[model samples]
Target chain A: IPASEQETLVRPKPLLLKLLKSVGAQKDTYTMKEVLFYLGQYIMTKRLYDEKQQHIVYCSNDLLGDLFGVPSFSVKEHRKIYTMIYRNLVVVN
Target chain B: IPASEQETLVRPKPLLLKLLKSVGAQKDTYTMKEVLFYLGQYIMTKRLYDEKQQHIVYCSNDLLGDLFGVPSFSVKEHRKIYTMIYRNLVVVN
Candidate 1:
């Protein structure tokens, strides 16, 4: 249901709850729209974190480069591997 | 006509062109949507410029404070006055 005669979405509770749970969530049931909103918000805020604090995630290739005292390992190549893994695990359904 | 029978907006050229011109525009006719998109992009880019370079627009009170060698002037207060002026001049439409 929607707010006070203002036109809006009207989805069932079960469907909404399923969506929230599917997205990795909480006890307080949320609509798919709400979960989607917070997911986008997190991605944007994480982008700021990526810019300001690159130290948060040091990929394996960077670690190898550090151990060898050489800048031979590529961040892009390492991330490409990670993306392949992510696509298999997270991009389904 | 719709795009390949896909659902879409169908507005007259004059109405769309009129909207673009009303929003402050050009000889190249644009839909209301296009002007709105570019307008939003400009505002967002300007916001980044504001954050990165506050020195770009020094308020009158700040200038006065600089001239008199006094710390009595306030940026917030000066902006409040500017807001009042802006409300009168630019906000009516």
Candidate 2:
């Protein structure tokens, strides 16, 4: 990519940093597949139903990379995104 | 779409629940532009360069949709992703 194209690429919107836990708050975490299933089936198709409804549309391999700093393809890359959710999430267990 | 493929659609991951208040830490939020810039400028190209470094790829309009269950194009559908990033994110502050 050229410097000009690269220059164009350098247009991040104002983003906030996050620190989870150590408070009454809960952890917000998920995988790209979860995201994909949410929009693709939950909201749009209404096919996949959970106790709580979340959904997605045609998902990408890189949804985690694009949103959070992690990539969903490899657990090594997305350890924080994975571990935080795993430890803090309230599951049926 | 075939039922076989559609049958695959129900595969949501072990997503964690979230409550973003009560932590002494700041909030995490960003616009689509910010996420794009973080990936393109801060991380991948290093062209934009922020105080802290983060990055993304082509940045599908649907990145937020895939992650948090919001879509890219609509009067009703578009803004859920937009508001979450802008309202509570900690920036240069």
Candidate 3:
């Protein structure tokens, strides 16, 4: 069913796992929404959003910078970032 | 230069260009946002959203189906779809 399907589990790559673990997610697998939720919290809690630019996020921390391969990016690139994150995850059917 | 960077022009592959042309976009290059905007409008006007499932989009037409390689998918896969679309575009910095 689509409902169950939506909750498809995925295992994060080492770096992503480290990020999740740092944020207190103790699981070996997570839903895509779950991962994004944790990442969103991290960005907000760390104040990564650019002060002068709406929808722009700055990767002031090493982890985010490394994950994004840049110091900052527009949230418009969320689509691209999603793919980047997916590359670091192994979908668990 | 972030503002200018935001307007990075991209040339879509043949199929995407076909879709854009059908929708009246006559440019050889378009911003990523512009391409997505045109795609969004097409999805809305074509009524591709699944009736019973929120966020689910059906590939009821040939172009979308060919682009997505699936009959239906969730909007959640927008990240993946974004990558797919990007692969079909040449970034024209």
Candidate 4:
């Protein structure tokens, strides 16, 4: 596996699991890569991009708004988002 | 920064610092990306690839051998190697 894919397995915190389920992920544990995959899927499915600038994602949905505590963010801030998501997960050895 | 580069900062354990210093890294803390950069530099400087097969890296050096506990490994096993290296470092808040 590539280093990016071979991340430590993690279980989502209670609140995060709600987001995971909304993204159609049924597993109790996921690698960070898997979590990102689901997040990407959710973004695409919801068409969450800002109308004026597609590169920006508007937190129009309740889950995203609550999780990020922001109205919108540029795609370039993905690293910050990744860190925020990881904070809601517990490494599972 | 890209998500790969925006990793949490980490402090190497005493034993791992020997490897870090050997690669000319002077910092007390590094992101995982920086650590991998130094590791790649060390591999290039030492020409640690197997003579018979360039894709395989022979753990001929003391530090690498001690860290991996293996004689050699295919480049495809880099994910495993990454995890091993992470074990020797502590994440900084």
DockQ of each: 0.01, 0.02, 0.02, 0.03
Off by over 4 Å in 1: A1-27, A48-93, B1-93
lDDT of each: 0.34, 0.29, 0.72, 0.72
Q: What does fnat come to for each candidate?
A: 0.00, 0.00, 0.00, 0.00
Higher-scoring candidate on lDDT, 1 or 3: 3
DockQ-based class of model 2: incorrect
lDDT of candidate 1 over A1-93, digit per residue (tens): 012211112222343334344455554423234544643343344442245554333333432223224443233455543332222221111
lDDT-sorted candidate list, best first: 4, 3, 1, 2
Which clashing pairs does model 1 show? none
Q: Per-residue error at B43 for model 2, in Å?
A: 14
Candidate 1's TM-score: 0.15
Docking class of 3: incorrect
Residue B82's lDDT within candidate 1 is: 34
Better of 1 and 2 by TM-score: 1
Regions more than 4 Å wrong, model 2: A1-93, B1-36, B39-63, B74-79, B86-93
Please give, for residues A33-88, the per-residue lDDT of candidate 2 as tens digits: 44333323322343222324332222233332344443223323355543433333
lDDT of 1 by residue, B1-92 (tens): 11221111112234334433444556453333454464344334444223555433332343222322443323345554333222222111
i-RMS for every candidate: 16.8, 18.3, 17.9, 11.1
TM-score of chain A of each: 0.25, 0.20, 0.80, 0.77
Model 4: residues with Cα > 4 Å off, grouped in runs: A1-93, B1-7, B91-93
